[PDB]
């Protein structure tokens, strides 16, 4: 998220690095703003509660057998918010699809920043020779360097479209493509997951697009 807000300025000087930057920023902002509430939700579904539950369960052990269940209850409390059951593996796989989409947006932002830096390297790499030639007394523009710079600029302007389209898909998807997992999340029977469905927020394309969010 910080990179979608920051690394757009790594090469925010070419209009080819505009659609990709803005669209990938939309994607990252939507996904991160949605996951901001999910962070606290995960921190309380099985994180904040299960530790105290384990403390309470061990608080009544007065025998080896009495203390045996104390940690098993903490185990179940922690495991509850993982959906690791084979039956719960439908919602678990939906959530891991959300994690996979977050990872994919991470790779997309990595590609965007690479386009923002490696393609920004050509604008200054060729300036060393001309800068030294000016002091050395040379004049004119090298045809091989001018043609290479023209090819590099054309590549930065035309192939930036691959980044632009990928980031536009990201901007759409961060709030839209989450719907396959949200189909199960919209059917949240657990009151904690229903609270997540009530705060499935900051999407910019889920509440407006996904019916369950608005």
């Amino acid at each position: 998220r910080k990179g979608h807000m920051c690394n757009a300025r790594l090469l925010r000087s070419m209009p080819e690095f505009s659609g990709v930057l803005h669209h990938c920023h939309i994607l990252a902002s939507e996904m991160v703003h949605f996951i901001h509430q999910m962070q606290y939700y995960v921190t309380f579904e099985v994180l904040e509660c299960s530790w105290d539950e384990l403390w309470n369960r061990v608080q009544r052990a007065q025998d080896l057998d009495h203390i045996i269940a104390a940690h098993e209850a903490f185990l179940g409390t922690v495991i509850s918010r993982c959906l690791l059951d084979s039956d719960s593996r439908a919602l678990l796989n939906q959530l891991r699809a959300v994690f996979d989409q977050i990872i994919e947006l991470q790779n997309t932002q990595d590609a965007i920043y690479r386009a923002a830096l490696e393609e920004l390297q050509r604008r200054l790499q060729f300036e060393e020779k001309k800068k030294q030639r000016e002091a050395e007394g040379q004049w004119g523009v090298s045809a091989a360097e001018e043609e290479q710079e023209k090819r590099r600029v054309q590549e930065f302007q035309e192939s930036i479209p691959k980044m632009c389209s990928q980031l536009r898909i990201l901007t759409h998807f961060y709030q839209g493509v989450v719907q396959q997992f949200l189909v199960s999340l919209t059917t949240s029977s657990d009151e904690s997951l229903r609270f997540l469905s009530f705060r499935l927020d900051f999407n910019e394309h889920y509440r407006a697009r996904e019916p369950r969010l608005r």
Partner: protein, 442 residues
Amino acid sequence: MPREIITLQLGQCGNQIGFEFWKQLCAEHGISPEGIVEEFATEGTDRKDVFFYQADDEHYIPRAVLLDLEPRVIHSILNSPYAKLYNPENIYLSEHGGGAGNNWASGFSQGEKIHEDIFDIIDREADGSDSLEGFVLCHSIAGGTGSGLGSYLLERLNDRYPKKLVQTYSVFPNVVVQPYNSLLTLKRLTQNADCVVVLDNTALNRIATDRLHIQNPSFSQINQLVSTIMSASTTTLRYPGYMNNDLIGLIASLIPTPRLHFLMTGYTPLTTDQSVASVRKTTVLDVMRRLLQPKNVMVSTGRDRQTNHCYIAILNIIQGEVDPTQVHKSLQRIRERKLANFIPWGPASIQVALSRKSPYLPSAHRVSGLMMANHTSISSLFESSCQQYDKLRKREAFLEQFRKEDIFKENFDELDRSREVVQELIDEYHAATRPDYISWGT
């Protein structure tokens, strides 16, 4: 690894607030006035290197820089009991005793004059920081140092540390060039700060007077309230928790869009310790209902009846004995009761995090709530700032004083473009309250 925060204090009010925040962090991590951690907080689970730089003399040296172009404020900050607590190498005072003179232009000129000095202090704080999340600049958009120096520091920090979060603490005035300076500080925050937290003096004073029963509030009480809000927001960073221990996550949660960086703050209970809550357990639900009440917000954001102000995102860090189950129930009840109205650019983002108040800092409330919410109502405060800037620029009110300074030397163009930026921010915040902010940039 410790996750430090670099704090840059600009102006007299900023330096006083920085000293108060350093003392609050010291009390939270159990650090004495010399920065030495108390015996009761030596074995704390708090990552004190996260909030303050840890001096090898067991002193929690806050990674804070106290900047004041007038020797009075700088001397008082270094004369405070935290003189030994704060590292002297991070405190710079402008030898030019002319100050910024309540002019954003003069403040910017002074900041440009000490651009190397501020960047050096920032780099030194990064050196003394383990895993620093970013730098927070605290300044007053209407003051001279606060506005002009905030702009200069923001530009220098954007040039030197682009990968660190840029937090701006705009302390609004309760100066004829105050409106041009407000525009300039708004432009600086919108251009070089990734997240700007609005601390409006009018609403802060109103809240303090209503709850603490303090008539004619001075800057000290507003600074204390701001320090309490900041400590509640930083309790997750100070005490190493399980989630949201870094400012980057909060910034993404409240300002997923860098331009709509206007983050409003809330404190619960918003009442003095003398305000005795009679056998009232401030529950997560109670704290949420009080925060859903606009009267508890310490920011004077215009409650325009024509503009449907809404919370783009809200994150409530409850410090103290707050039950995560009660927090989830409070979040659900606030969403259901629509105690927080949210933008169509993203659904009702109301997050409740159960956090612990620092054990060495006494927390009188079992469950308190600090809200960092990006709401479109702050767009009304942006409209107010733009209107003030336009009021000064259209008549060039104190545009002569800025014309003595570079930001308005040729004309009042710095203040004019600054007011334009403030108006653009207000319009963008209204769009963020509108469904089209997802496609506004598309």
